[PDB]
Design a protein around this ligand. Structure first.
Ligand SMILES: O=[N+]([O-])c1ccc2nn[nH]c2c1
Length: 300
């Protein structure tokens, strides 16, 4: 049974997965995504080192493939991350002039969003902007532009494609008592109060075993920021216990504004964390106990 169809029957928008051309053309990934998932993200092909490896030199073959495949197969598309410190080329992080970096950031945002205008449901505009203690991460954008870089990025994104839902995402938002979790909520409340167009908070849930349970308290805390949507991304769980995965799914079901969940790949061997066997399909492309547990859960 399709977890995406089953979650939609429970009133959510999607169960999605990260993918890209060479997953689509090998294994059983295309078959599983067609049957079982309702949304795709580019696993790597939309990151800055993939899309703008030198200034103004845009590389879109990878991302085009993904977007075209999704459209042909009636799948929603999420994409990201436009502004974060990972996968960022040296030419960007060596910029020291503030107006230059502002316009470099704006051109990156606008060129990518314009190319796919109208085709992308959700854009992760800003990513990993927080330190663990809740202060803003001192990436090149904060160091050169200052904290205005976040509102600027969001405004720029809303102008480029007003149809897209715009998200901020971060990791280690999995415990309601962790300082980072309350901090992003506080700053999102304040940005939105000031007219900054943040439609969603995305929680990057690269989890260790046993961490699923805590998401049942953390996700409602994130939703208290008052964004129209929240979501779960990059989900994987070391060991892939049915208990962890079902807890995450149920957190989504519990939180009215949570639109869905995206897993960090289809089958274990294609995970960055393969030895932890953290995904829902195994190396032979069979649905694992966690997949079947999610099915049972989703089936007062
Ligand atoms: O949820 N995801 O797996 C995922 C993968 C890559 C991304 N880039 N921006 N947001 C993303 C989400």
């Amino acid at each position: 049974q399709s977890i995406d169809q089953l979650i939609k029957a429970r009133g959510k928008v999607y169960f999605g997965v990260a993918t890209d051309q060479n997953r689509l053309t090998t294994g059983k990934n295309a078959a599983i995504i067609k049957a079982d998932f309702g949304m795709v993200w580019p696993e790597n092909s939309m990151f800055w080192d993939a899309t703008e490896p030198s200034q103004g030199n845009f590389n879109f073959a990878g991302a085009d493939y993904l977007v075209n495949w999704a459209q042909q197969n009636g799948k929603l598309i999420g994409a990201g991350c436009l502004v974060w410190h990972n996968f960022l080329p040296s030419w960007v992080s060596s910029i020291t002039d503030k107006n230059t970096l502002i316009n470099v950031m704006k051109n990156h945002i606008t060129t990518l969003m314009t190319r796919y205008k109208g085709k992308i449901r959700t854009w992760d505009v800003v990513g990993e902007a927080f330190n663990e203690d809740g202060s803003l991460r001192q990436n090149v954008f904060l160091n050169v532009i200052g904290e205005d870089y976040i509102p600027i990025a969001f405004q720029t994104a809303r102008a480029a494609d007003p149809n897209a839902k715009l998200y901020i995402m971060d990791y280690n938002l999995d415990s309601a008592s962790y300082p980072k979790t309350q901090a992003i909520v506080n700053r999102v409340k304040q940005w939105r109060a000031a007219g900054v167009p943040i439609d969603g908070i995305g929680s990057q849930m690269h989890l260790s075993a046993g961490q699923g349970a805590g998401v049942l308290q953390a996700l409602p805390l994130l939703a208290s920021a008052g964004t129209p949507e929240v979501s779960i991304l990059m989900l994987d769980v070391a060991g892939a216990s049915p208990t962890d995965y079902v807890n995450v799914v149920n957190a989504c079901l519990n939180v009215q504004s949570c639109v869905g969940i995206t897993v960090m790949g289809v089958a274990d061997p294609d995970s960055a964390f393969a030895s932890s066997t953290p995904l829902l399909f195994d190396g032979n492309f069979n649905p694992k106990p966690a997949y079947n547990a999610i099915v049972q859960d989703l089936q007062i």
